[PDB]
Design a protein around this ligand. Structure first.
Ligand SMILES: [Mg+2]
Ligand SMILES: [Mg+2]
Ligand SMILES: [Mg+2]
Ligand SMILES: [Mg+2]
Ligand SMILES: [Mg+2]
Ligand SMILES: [Mg+2]
Ligand SMILES: [Mg+2]
Ligand SMILES: [Mg+2]
Ligand SMILES: [Mg+2]
Ligand SMILES: [Mg+2]
Ligand SMILES: [Mg+2]
Ligand SMILES: [Mg+2]
Ligand SMILES: [Mg+2]
Ligand SMILES: [Mg+2]
Ligand SMILES: [Mg+2]
Ligand SMILES: [Mg+2]
Ligand SMILES: [Mg+2]
Ligand SMILES: [Mg+2]
Ligand SMILES: [Mg+2]
Ligand SMILES: [Mg+2]
Ligand SMILES: [Mg+2]
Ligand SMILES: [Mg+2]
Ligand SMILES: [Mg+2]
Ligand SMILES: [Mg+2]
Ligand SMILES: [Mg+2]
Ligand SMILES: [Mg+2]
Ligand SMILES: [Mg+2]
Ligand SMILES: [Mg+2]
Ligand SMILES: [Mg+2]
Ligand SMILES: [Mg+2]
Ligand SMILES: [Mg+2]
Ligand SMILES: [Mg+2]
Ligand SMILES: [Mg+2]
Ligand SMILES: [Mg+2]
Ligand SMILES: [Mg+2]
Ligand SMILES: [Mg+2]
Ligand SMILES: [Mg+2]
Ligand SMILES: [Mg+2]
Ligand SMILES: [Mg+2]
Ligand SMILES: [Mg+2]
Ligand SMILES: [Mg+2]
Ligand SMILES: [Mg+2]
Ligand SMILES: [Mg+2]
Ligand SMILES: [Mg+2]
Ligand SMILES: [Mg+2]
Ligand SMILES: [Mg+2]
Ligand SMILES: [Mg+2]
Ligand SMILES: [Mg+2]
Ligand SMILES: [Mg+2]
Ligand SMILES: [Mg+2]
Ligand SMILES: [Mg+2]
Ligand SMILES: [Mg+2]
Ligand SMILES: [Mg+2]
Ligand SMILES: [Mg+2]
Ligand SMILES: [Mg+2]
Lengths: 227, 122, 95, 46
RNA sequence: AACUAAUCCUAGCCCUAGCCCUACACAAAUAUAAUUAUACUAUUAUAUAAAUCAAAACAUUUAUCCUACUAAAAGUAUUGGAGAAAGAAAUUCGUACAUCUAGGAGCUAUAGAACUAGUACCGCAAGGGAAAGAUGAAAGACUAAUUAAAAGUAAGAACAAGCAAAGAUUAAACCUUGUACCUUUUGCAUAAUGAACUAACUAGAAAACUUCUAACUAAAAGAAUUACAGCUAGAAACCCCGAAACCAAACGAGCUACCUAAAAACAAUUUUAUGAAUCAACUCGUCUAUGUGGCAAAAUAGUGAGAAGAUUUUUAGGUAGAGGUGAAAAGCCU
RNA sequence: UCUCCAGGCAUACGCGUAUAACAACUCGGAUAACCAUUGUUAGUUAAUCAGACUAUAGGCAAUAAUCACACUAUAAAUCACCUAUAACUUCUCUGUUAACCCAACACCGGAAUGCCUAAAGGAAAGAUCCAAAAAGAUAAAAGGAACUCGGCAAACAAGAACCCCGCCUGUUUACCAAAAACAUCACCUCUAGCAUUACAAGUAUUAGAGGCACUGCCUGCCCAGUGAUCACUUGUUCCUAGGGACUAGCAUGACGGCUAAACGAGGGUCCAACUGUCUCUUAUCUUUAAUCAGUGAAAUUGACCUUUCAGUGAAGAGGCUGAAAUAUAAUAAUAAGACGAGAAGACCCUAUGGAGCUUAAAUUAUAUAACUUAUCUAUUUUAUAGUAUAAGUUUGAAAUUUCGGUUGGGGUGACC
């Protein structure tokens, strides 16, 4: 009987109503423990492909205007509404974004490095080595999947041929083609980790249930004596 | 503790449960939640004029009842259709193609009163 | 044992008896001696001789062995060249 | 607490849990009806 | 000198024989929360049966269950922790009652079907599942009689002293004699189990060997078998009630545990700006007494804890036993 | 008409004629009156209260609520309007009663929301009597915890301090345990680099699993040794006792006493006040009790014409031995005996009877996870990729089965 709420087919900026799970599969059995309740929330669709040219428009760099920087219940970072041409869409907001700023989305792998301003999206090859980045994309055209959390940044360690080495926040190095976009700058809410929950009731608001009350080297035959 | 044996009707259950007692519909419900009666859906009683009629509910005990002979398809055919065909056959002006001349109907479509499937009540 | 079998309704023979004893038609039973093939190196020459013999059975053992076999094993057999031909009968027995 | 009152009647629940449409929804439920027909029960379902 | 009661005979049923079937029951309604005259929204059994149980335990294994013509070959060949047990075929034999639409050394209201009925009633559900009737040819003859007849009572309470009776006696009681019954214990009970009384119901079953009675006899038997007096036939036999468990398939979250969706309640006062304070509504249940077949299969009377929050409450939906749920009590799942 | 008491009226859910009149007086109400019972006849009226109620295809949404202004905050928070197509006057159907539902019952129990607090709704005593014991309330001379396991209970009191444990508000064994146990903010360890059904429309400041009071404060040491960024001695490796290579892109840790104010139907200690707890009990009223009228159960029961003392006996005699006593029956009381009745009440032992749990018991284990060899495709010049299956090996989630005997019951020993 369970039907997923993620059924909308068309992008929009209007908030969408969410249904909670409780940690239960579509069968109806618990699969993840510690989930339940919390405040009602609305989903705002985030577009993670920064360089999406508008309809019936050629693929060259374009600019957009920052309308708002807003709090989001569904993430640790904060989001910004940005408008360009005749289209509006949500995106992630960098550390120092302010309302009214203009930002650039580029498709040009400059033969020489392109001067980088926080928040603009460029192919990884253009940026100079050592420049912090976030919202990294593993494959060209896939959409950002890494380093999209609050206060987290990656580093472009090296570039050889058409492949670059990125240092993820965990410090595990990774490699990708140089034709996949990335946006410069650290993610917002640098001080997220400093929060103090304070009282048990606050965790219940976030949708977390309490833990449960309930409270291997086999020796070889010559090791049995001194076990 | 519920009664399994008594009939399920609309007097029982919560408010949102309703059903009919067997009366036929006389109209349609549109959106905007408005009922719209249709005149042709309301049955019309065809009542004859009873002035000067000699028949009454009861019959005299001295009236002789007759031997029962239910009507059959054979009897109807002989009384109505057989005489005309016999005369024409003697004259020779008979053919299978023109059975409609004697009252045969190839199909029931187009008739107001169709004999199968019946499209009228008693 | 089976006094009444499902398929035929008869008694059944215990086949472990048939593999160990011989029945003479008079009613005697013959057997070997337990251990007559085991650890011969540690047995004296007189002890080994006693083991090689064929021996008779007691009255109570004969009674039990009769119950555990059917009549087919108790009939008269006429084998040409039988080496037990002379032991199927009793002679000069007052009893 | 005092027991003995576990039946809190509700017609919507009763018809959904044990009703005719519910019994016919699965093959196991259809066999429930067949057994009660062979016994001769006057009441096949709720 | 009679009350309560008792007497009764047929409703039907049981096992065989025979035979395939062609029964598929006015109008209307019903798969929707069945029995609601018309569109929304599609519809569909199952991979090998297991365990109990026997082997005096249990682990390979255990007839029927899991069907393929009778009689014989034969409990033979073969298989088997070679042990409990299991077990063929080749090859012989057979037209069978054959209108037997019929039969009974079968039951007669606690019997025979559970049945007057799968009803009443019990359970949320799957499911479990009763009791009983009696005149005569005629009731358009007022419902018939028949029986010192069960226990229980009445007619009619009792009269020093004793397992309640026996020997007696002119005399009912007085005198004499006398440690209730069954089972179990050491052959013993003032030991300890069991029994208020009446009526009906309620528990030893098989033919290998032996003994007895007959037929025929070096042969017996109505085909297949046994025989150095045998062989054929008859008669003669081995109980009842009672677990905790184990496995297969259904049915259950209207109680309770947790979750999803849509809704709802919170006075007055002091603080502040809150899982703060005092204290109603409401939710819970510290301590004492009463109650103990109770008003109640967990209550009542007082007294107590929280009471804007991890609060309480309503409606509908979800998770199912090799499982679910759990602020873990091995708690809860009618 | 009078005396006294103080949750009532509607809706939802549920129930299904219990509704009203007449007639009956059998059964039902635990008794009468009267009916809630039996029979017969009647009843609830809606385009507004309530339910059900099918035109189609496209395009599109940054800005809570709380008197919403000011005002901030954090847990981030209820179809409309347009563009075209099509149709072009309508009221049928169903709910509506009641003293009512879930609890075996006319059950001192449970039951959501709105309005209101007496203008609505009701009756604690069948008649009589004033004993014991039992239950509940109120008053008490002088004394004031001397009571008791304990100030339990009660009081003209309802206040103060200190110790143990746990930080705090919360949760738990429905029906013998509410706590010092569980959870909890804080702190710490382990695993994981990724998309279209959970985690999550999320991405290392994230997610899952687990442990544990916090806070500060002492105790902090497996860096290779000595020289001193430098040389030897070590160590680890090779090439042959010789010869090379490597060890300068780093650098310890493990306890205690702490508590910290607050908080608690938690477990103790103490002072003051207070009192019938006690010295030492008494008086009154209500319920019960007793007598009259009506209706009318339960455990229990071998038969009983059912006595005391000494002796005998299985710690044991109404019934046996020896003595003694002794007209017959009811009503109200006490609890020594009838090893008094119901105990699903507990301790000890046995059975080739069971079940739950733990493993390092035996036997298996295509749960997963790995490999290997074939098979089937790709390539490759043999060769590396993969793999609807078969055979091996490695892990073990699980599965079935068992718990020798004599030595008091154990504990070490033994023993067959
Ligand atoms: Mg824990
Ligand atoms: Mg019930
Ligand atoms: Mg066995
Ligand atoms: Mg054959
Ligand atoms: Mg009968
Ligand atoms: Mg019967
Ligand atoms: Mg009598
Ligand atoms: Mg006498
Ligand atoms: Mg005893
Ligand atoms: Mg008894
Ligand atoms: Mg009798
Ligand atoms: Mg529920
Ligand atoms: Mg409920
Ligand atoms: Mg308030
Ligand atoms: Mg509780
Ligand atoms: Mg408090
Ligand atoms: Mg309070
Ligand atoms: Mg509060
Ligand atoms: Mg525990
Ligand atoms: Mg325990
Ligand atoms: Mg139960
Ligand atoms: Mg009335
Ligand atoms: Mg009257
Ligand atoms: Mg009435
Ligand atoms: Mg309306
Ligand atoms: Mg609709
Ligand atoms: Mg009304
Ligand atoms: Mg009850
Ligand atoms: Mg009662
Ligand atoms: Mg009034
Ligand atoms: Mg009185
Ligand atoms: Mg007082
Ligand atoms: Mg005083
Ligand atoms: Mg004292
Ligand atoms: Mg004292
Ligand atoms: Mg007290
Ligand atoms: Mg605590
Ligand atoms: Mg508390
Ligand atoms: Mg809970
Ligand atoms: Mg309890
Ligand atoms: Mg408490
Ligand atoms: Mg308690
Ligand atoms: Mg704890
Ligand atoms: Mg406490
Ligand atoms: Mg003092
Ligand atoms: Mg009386
Ligand atoms: Mg006497
Ligand atoms: Mg004595
Ligand atoms: Mg005496
Ligand atoms: Mg006594
Ligand atoms: Mg008494
Ligand atoms: Mg006793
Ligand atoms: Mg034994
Ligand atoms: Mg056993
Ligand atoms: Mg067993």
């Amino acid at each position: 009987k369970f039907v997923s709420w993620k059924s909308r087919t068309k992008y929009t900026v209007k908030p969408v109503k969410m249904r909670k799970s409780g940690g239960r599969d579509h069968t109806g059995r618990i699969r993840v423990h510690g989930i339940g309740g919390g405040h009602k929330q609305n989903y705002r669709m985030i577009d993670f492909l920064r360089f999406r040219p508008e309809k019936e428009k050629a693929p060259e760099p374009f600019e957009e205007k920052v309308v708002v920087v807003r709090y989001d219940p569904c993430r640790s970072a904060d989001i910004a509404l940005v408008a360009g041409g005749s289209r509006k869409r949500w995106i992630i907001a960098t550390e120092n974004m302010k309302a009214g700023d203009t930002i650039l989305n580029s498709n040009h792998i400059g033969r020489m490095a392109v001067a980088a301003q926080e928040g603009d999206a460029h192919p990884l090859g253009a940026l100079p080595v050592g420049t912090l980045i976030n919202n990294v994309e593993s494959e060209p055209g896939r959409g950002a999947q890494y380093i999209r959390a609050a206060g987290t940044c990656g580093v472009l360690l090296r570039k050889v041929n058409g492949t670059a080495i990125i240092q993820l926040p965990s410090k595990r190095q990774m490699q990708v083609l140089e034709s996949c976009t990335a946006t410069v700058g650290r993610v917002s809410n640098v001080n997220h980790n400093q929060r103090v929950i304070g009282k048990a009731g606050r965790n219940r608001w976030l949708g977390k249930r309490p833990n449960s009350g309930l409270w291997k080297i086999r020796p070889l035959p010559p090791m049995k004596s001194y076990v | 503790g519920a009664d399994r044996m008594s009939k399920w009707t609309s007097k029982r259950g919560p408010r949102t449960f309703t059903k009919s007692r067997g009366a036929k519909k006389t109209g349609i419900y549109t959106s905007d939640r408005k009922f719209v009666q249709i005149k042709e859906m309301v049955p019309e009683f065809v009542v004859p004029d009873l002035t000067g009629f000699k028949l009454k509910p009861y019959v005299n005990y001295r009236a002789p009842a007759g031997i029962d002979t239910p009507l059959t398809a054979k009897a109807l055919f002989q009384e109505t259709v057989a005489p005309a065909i016999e005369k024409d056959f003697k004259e020779g002006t008979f053919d299978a193609n023109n059975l409609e001349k004697y009252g045969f109907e190839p199909t029931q479509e187009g008739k107001l009163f169709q004999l199968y499937p019946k499209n009228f009540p008693r | 044992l089976t006094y009444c079998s499902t398929r035929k309704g008869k008694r059944k023979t215990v086949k472990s008896v048939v593999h160990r004893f011989l029945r003479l038609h008079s009613g005697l039973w013959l057997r070997r001696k337990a251990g007559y093939k085991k650890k011969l190196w540690k047995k004296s020459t007189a002890r080994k001789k006693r083991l090689r013999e064929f021996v008779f059975c007691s009255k109570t053992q004969s009674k039990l062995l009769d119950k555990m076999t059917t009549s087919f094993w108790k009939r008269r057999n006429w084998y040409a060249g039988d080496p037990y031909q002379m032991y199927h009968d009793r002679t000069n027995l007052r009893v | 607490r005092a027991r003995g009152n576990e039946y809190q009647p509700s017609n919507i629940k009763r018809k959904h849990k044990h009703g005719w449409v519910r019994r016919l929804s699965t093959p196991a439920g259809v066999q429930v009806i067949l057994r009660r027909m062979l016994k001769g029960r006057k009441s096949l379902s709720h």
